[PDB]
Amino acid sequence: VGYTPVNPDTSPMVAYSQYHWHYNLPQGMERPHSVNRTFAAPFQSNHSLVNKYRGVWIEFDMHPAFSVALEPQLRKLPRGRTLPKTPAEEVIADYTALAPLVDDEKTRDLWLAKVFQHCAFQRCGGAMELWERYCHQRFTAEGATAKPPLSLVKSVLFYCNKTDNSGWRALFDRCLKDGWNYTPLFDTAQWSFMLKSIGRMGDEDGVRAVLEEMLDVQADLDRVEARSVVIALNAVTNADVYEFVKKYLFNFGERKVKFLRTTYSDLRGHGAGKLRIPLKENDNMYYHVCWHSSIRSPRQFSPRQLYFDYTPSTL
Amino acid sequence: HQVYLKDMLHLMRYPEPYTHIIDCRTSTQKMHRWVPHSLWLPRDEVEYALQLSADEFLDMYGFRKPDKSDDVILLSHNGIYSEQAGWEWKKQFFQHVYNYRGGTNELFGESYSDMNVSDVLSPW
């Protein structure tokens, strides 16, 4: 009785009533409850994971001989979680000079991959020359048999995305099932960077090819970084690719799709500053990603909105 | 439980002895092709058909009545009549009953419909 309701735990007139347990009965537990055991939820935090590497790990496997031999050259290149500020010109000079002296293929290529990664972080454009000078001959040209070491490919790809470069499309294509079959070994961050670059450059077709492979190779869709999905989708103006992207959008999860919308509305919105290159206007893809989000969320009832104009009829 | 286009092509080239593909298309006027290894029980007859003895069923439809263990795949234009037929086959208790939605339309590229039903509701 009142506008303030009784709280059923603290009130003995609830607790001890006939619909609950009186204090003179024997007070044991009624039934056991196993909730967590029967059907358990997987852990997904609202906050992203604080320790994760957040980059493209380039996997440095060197024989612990050349690793010691080449140390004064390698000390200038990135080691794990450490990014020395050495100017990229110098590093490339060192590779060009000293590398023909080393005899190992595997070593020369690990070293090269480090150089590429280093040049990806500084966004120096003259590093593809290195690909055409050493690797192109035995990997990409005229159906050469040789199969490049994975780390090298990851590194070059990462470089083509960081420095936006038409070249990526040629490399990526070699990684599908009939080629090197490297695509299932890519990191989630790899996909993230790829999508973002392709999106900036604006290839709907690059975007489609990449989303198809990602899906087939079972990438982690929900953990692909939202910004990069948005920038990729934003690039899609062509009727067919557009169709593809609706049908595809159904592959994300409820949550992912909600934040695809949030992120999208921010990047053309308040957070338009957050990007190094501003987005381009897609009103169509924006509207659609919002629409999709609305379709996939639970629906709420707002009767004064729906039935605002309802009039009954006696027909 | 569903059966997709992939399963359908596979079963065209590589049939299983005790899997039956049963065509539910109702009107003979609309059916010009034959789904490979299929048999014809039109939807309209199903409730009766499934209550025949093995012999009687043989006499009425001219092929052996599937046992209740065997796989039964159902077929129609859109996948609607095949569904309703499925409910019939499931109510007599048949253990494996699969409907192939989009069935004859997807197979042959025909656009036909089992029933004329439209998505739009007439305003109340």
Partner: peptide
């Protein structure tokens, strides 16, 4: 709101197979 996307074209899936055979 349906249909969300354009339905698959009329393509005939049985013909190519039985033609190969």
């Amino acid at each position: 709101y349906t249909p969300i996307w354009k339905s698959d074209p009329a393509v005939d899936n049985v013909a190519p197979l039985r033609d190969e055979d």
